[PDB]
Write an enzyme that holds these catalytic residues in place. Structure first.
Site, PDB file in Angstrom:
ATOM      1  N   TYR A 110       0.788  -1.218   0.000  1.00 23.15           N
ATOM      2  CA  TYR A 110       0.000   0.000   0.000  1.00 23.15           C
ATOM      3  C   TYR A 110       0.823   1.272   0.000  1.00 23.15           C
ATOM      4  CZ  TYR A 110       0.814   0.830   4.956  1.00 23.15           C
ATOM      5  OH  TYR A 110       1.443   0.986   6.171  1.00 23.15           O
ATOM      6  N   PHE A 120       1.847   9.955   3.203  1.00 25.28           N
ATOM      7  CA  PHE A 120       2.124   9.718   4.633  1.00 25.28           C
ATOM      8  C   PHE A 120       2.760   8.370   4.986  1.00 25.28           C
ATOM      9  CE2 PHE A 120      -2.530   8.892   4.294  1.00 25.28           C
ATOM     10  CZ  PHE A 120      -2.591   7.607   4.801  1.00 25.28           C
ATOM     11  N   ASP A 121       2.648   7.364   4.115  1.00 22.76           N
ATOM     12  CA  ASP A 121       3.225   6.046   4.348  1.00 22.76           C
ATOM     13  C   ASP A 121       3.200   5.191   3.090  1.00 22.76           C
ATOM     14  OD1 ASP A 121       4.486   4.083   5.793  1.00 22.76           O
ATOM     15  OD2 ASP A 121       2.671   3.401   6.843  1.00 22.76           O
ATOM     16  N   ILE A 140      -8.495   0.229  10.195  1.00 19.81           N
ATOM     17  CA  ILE A 140      -9.546   1.208  10.054  1.00 19.81           C
ATOM     18  C   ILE A 140     -10.687   0.642   9.186  1.00 19.81           C
ATOM     19  CG2 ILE A 140      -8.133   3.274  10.474  1.00 19.81           C
ATOM     20  CD1 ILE A 140      -7.889   3.648   7.442  1.00 19.81           C
ATOM     21  N   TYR A 166      -9.473   7.726  10.990  1.00 19.51           N
ATOM     22  CA  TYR A 166      -9.041   8.127  12.330  1.00 19.51           C
ATOM     23  C   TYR A 166      -9.865   9.268  12.999  1.00 19.51           C
ATOM     24  CZ  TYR A 166      -5.139   5.186  10.994  1.00 19.51           C
ATOM     25  OH  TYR A 166      -4.381   4.073  10.594  1.00 19.51           O
ATOM     26  N   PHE A 183      -5.760   5.708  -0.215  1.00 20.45           N
ATOM     27  CA  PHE A 183      -4.832   4.596  -0.298  1.00 20.45           C
ATOM     28  C   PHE A 183      -4.894   3.933  -1.671  1.00 20.45           C
ATOM     29  CE2 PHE A 183      -3.379   3.794   4.089  1.00 20.45           C
ATOM     30  CZ  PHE A 183      -4.323   4.471   4.852  1.00 20.45           C
TER      31      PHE A 183
HETATM   32  C1  LIG Z   1       0.161  -2.552  18.628  1.00 21.43           C
HETATM   33  C2  LIG Z   1      -0.110  -1.809  17.573  1.00 21.43           C
HETATM   34  C3  LIG Z   1       0.890  -1.662  16.441  1.00 21.43           C
HETATM   35  C4  LIG Z   1       0.308  -2.040  15.072  1.00 21.43           C
HETATM   36  C5  LIG Z   1       1.205  -1.574  13.952  1.00 21.43           C
HETATM   37  C6  LIG Z   1       1.451  -2.299  12.825  1.00 21.43           C
HETATM   38  C7  LIG Z   1       0.946  -3.691  12.543  1.00 21.43           C
HETATM   39  C8  LIG Z   1       2.353  -1.711  11.751  1.00 21.43           C
HETATM   40  C9  LIG Z   1       1.502  -1.194  10.567  1.00 21.43           C
HETATM   41  C10 LIG Z   1       2.206  -1.430   9.219  1.00 21.43           C
HETATM   42  C11 LIG Z   1       1.021   0.232  10.891  1.00 21.43           C
HETATM   43  C12 LIG Z   1       1.985   1.301  10.399  1.00 21.43           C
HETATM   44  O1  LIG Z   1       3.183   1.263  11.190  1.00 21.43           O
HETATM   45  C13 LIG Z   1       4.286   1.849  10.490  1.00 21.43           C
HETATM   46  C14 LIG Z   1       1.356   2.712  10.403  1.00 21.43           C
HETATM   47  O2  LIG Z   1       0.433   2.728   9.310  1.00 21.43           O
HETATM   48  C15 LIG Z   1      -0.090   4.023   9.001  1.00 21.43           C
HETATM   49  O3  LIG Z   1       1.014   4.858   8.599  1.00 21.43           O
HETATM   50  C16 LIG Z   1      -1.009   3.748   7.813  1.00 21.43           C
HETATM   51  O4  LIG Z   1      -0.591   3.883   6.662  1.00 21.43           O
HETATM   52  C17 LIG Z   1      -2.408   3.324   8.043  1.00 21.43           C
HETATM   53  O5  LIG Z   1      -3.217   4.227   8.221  1.00 21.43           O
HETATM   54  N1  LIG Z   1      -2.720   2.024   8.064  1.00 21.43           N
HETATM   55  C18 LIG Z   1      -1.766   0.882   7.910  1.00 21.43           C
HETATM   56  C19 LIG Z   1      -2.211   0.009   6.754  1.00 21.43           C
HETATM   57  C20 LIG Z   1      -3.603  -0.559   6.989  1.00 21.43           C
HETATM   58  C21 LIG Z   1      -4.542   0.644   7.106  1.00 21.43           C
HETATM   59  C22 LIG Z   1      -4.131   1.598   8.232  1.00 21.43           C
HETATM   60  C23 LIG Z   1      -4.487   0.969   9.543  1.00 21.43           C
HETATM   61  O6  LIG Z   1      -5.613   0.659   9.838  1.00 21.43           O
HETATM   62  O7  LIG Z   1      -3.462   0.783  10.509  1.00 21.43           O
HETATM   63  C24 LIG Z   1      -3.899   0.203  11.741  1.00 21.43           C
HETATM   64  C25 LIG Z   1      -4.193   1.252  12.770  1.00 21.43           C
HETATM   65  C26 LIG Z   1      -3.149   2.307  13.047  1.00 21.43           C
HETATM   66  C27 LIG Z   1      -5.381   1.185  13.449  1.00 21.43           C
HETATM   67  C28 LIG Z   1      -5.817   2.132  14.550  1.00 21.43           C
HETATM   68  C29 LIG Z   1      -5.632   1.431  15.905  1.00 21.43           C
HETATM   69  C30 LIG Z   1      -6.169   2.296  17.047  1.00 21.43           C
HETATM   70  C31 LIG Z   1      -7.649   2.561  16.822  1.00 21.43           C
HETATM   71  O8  LIG Z   1      -8.188   3.351  17.895  1.00 21.43           O
HETATM   72  C32 LIG Z   1      -7.866   3.303  15.506  1.00 21.43           C
HETATM   73  O9  LIG Z   1      -9.271   3.547  15.341  1.00 21.43           O
HETATM   74  C33 LIG Z   1      -9.544   4.765  14.643  1.00 21.43           C
HETATM   75  C34 LIG Z   1      -7.298   2.496  14.342  1.00 21.43           C
HETATM   76  C35 LIG Z   1      -2.789  -0.712  12.224  1.00 21.43           C
HETATM   77  C36 LIG Z   1      -2.469  -1.655  11.092  1.00 21.43           C
HETATM   78  C37 LIG Z   1      -3.215  -1.477  13.479  1.00 21.43           C
HETATM   79  O10 LIG Z   1      -4.232  -2.436  13.098  1.00 21.43           O
HETATM   80  C38 LIG Z   1      -2.086  -2.271  14.129  1.00 21.43           C
HETATM   81  C39 LIG Z   1      -1.049  -1.404  14.819  1.00 21.43           C
HETATM   82  O11 LIG Z   1      -1.256  -0.219  15.151  1.00 21.43           O
HETATM   83  C40 LIG Z   1      -0.791   4.642  10.220  1.00 21.43           C
HETATM   84  C41 LIG Z   1      -1.231   6.099   9.954  1.00 21.43           C
HETATM   85  C42 LIG Z   1       0.074   4.581  11.496  1.00 21.43           C
HETATM   86  C43 LIG Z   1       0.648   3.160  11.684  1.00 21.43           C
HETATM   87  O12 LIG Z   1       1.572   3.155  12.788  1.00 21.43           O
HETATM   88  C44 LIG Z   1       1.043   2.691  14.031  1.00 21.43           C
END
Ligand SMILES: C=CC[C@@H]1/C=C(\C)C[C@H](C)C[C@H](OC)[C@H]2O[C@@](O)(C(=O)C(=O)N3CCCC[C@H]3C(=O)O[C@H](/C(C)=C/[C@@H]3CC[C@@H](O)[C@H](OC)C3)[C@H](C)[C@@H](O)CC1=O)[C@H](C)C[C@@H]2OC
Ligand SMILES: [Cl-]
Length: 190
Positions: A110, A120-121, A140, A166, A183
């Protein structure tokens, strides 16, 4: 003597500085090289008219900051679908492999951008495919909804409203409050 042209593909806006007598081939080739694709496989439009590689900005009366549309989707055009939730998706490449279904652990690449076009990523930037349980409520909401129905080899563009992302909180000092997320998701496995 030189012109800046903005090239918009639906995800980002990249600019190209070219001499007015340089064929647009140069721009089209540099654009394609970024996408890992052959120039002839992409369709570039200016003022609604197809750009040919041998045409120059002078030929087309282009000016500083004119916009070119780069079409990376399938021949025949595409449609952007807005679902019941307000998620938008667009199939840039239709997969030919297995269909992604809720409950599978799927593997993707992605890239994510803000609506301003800033990136952003990207999983590419880590050389690290991303795996998740589709429909598991751990990513998300726009992702759980949007990846379903993709086929392996597919590239789908998701435009995710902040209530399916978010919300007002944002994320990680890089996603602002109340932001739409764009994305591109490439399905590697299911
Ligand atoms: C223990 C936890 C660590 C665990 C981290 C990983 C597996 C590493 C993984 C490659 C994440 C990336 O790490 C470099 C980085 O990806 C971003 O850059 C991004 O591109 C993004 O948006 N993505 C990732 C790709 C799938 C879609 C989305 C997502 O859904 O991500 C999910 C997300 C952040 C969900 C929040 C969780 C909190 C809720 O409250 C909120 O609800 C609103 C939604 C991620 C996958 C979570 O399921 C799992 C985690 O967090 C974020 C901008 C910030 C994030 O860093 C943390
Ligand atoms: Cl040429």
């Amino acid at each position: 003597t030189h012109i800046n042209l903005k090239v918009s593909d639906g995800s980002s806006e990249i600019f190209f500085k070219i001499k007015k007598t340089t064929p647009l081939r140069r721009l089209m080739e540099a654009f394609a090289k970024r996408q890992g694709k052959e120039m002839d496989s992409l369709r570039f439009l200016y003022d609604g008219i197809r750009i040919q590689a041998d045409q120059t900005p002078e030929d087309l009366d282009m000016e500083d900051n004119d916009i070119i549309e780069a079409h990376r989707e399938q021949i025949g055009g595409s449609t952007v679908v807005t679902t019941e939730s307000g998620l938008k998706y667009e199939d840039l490449t239709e997969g030919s492999g297995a269909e992604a279904r809720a409950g599978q652990t799927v593997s993707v690449h992605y890239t994510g951008w803000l609506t301003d076009g800033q990136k952003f990523d990207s999983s590419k930037d880590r050389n690290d495919p991303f795996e998740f349980v589709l429909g598991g409520g751990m990513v998300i909401k726009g992702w759980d909804e949007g990846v379903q129905g993709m086929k392996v080899g597919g590239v789908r563009r998701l435009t995710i409203p902040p209530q399916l992302g978010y919300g007002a909180r944002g994320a990680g000092g890089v996603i602002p409050p109340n932001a739409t997320l764009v994305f591109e998701v490439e399905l590697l496995d299911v």
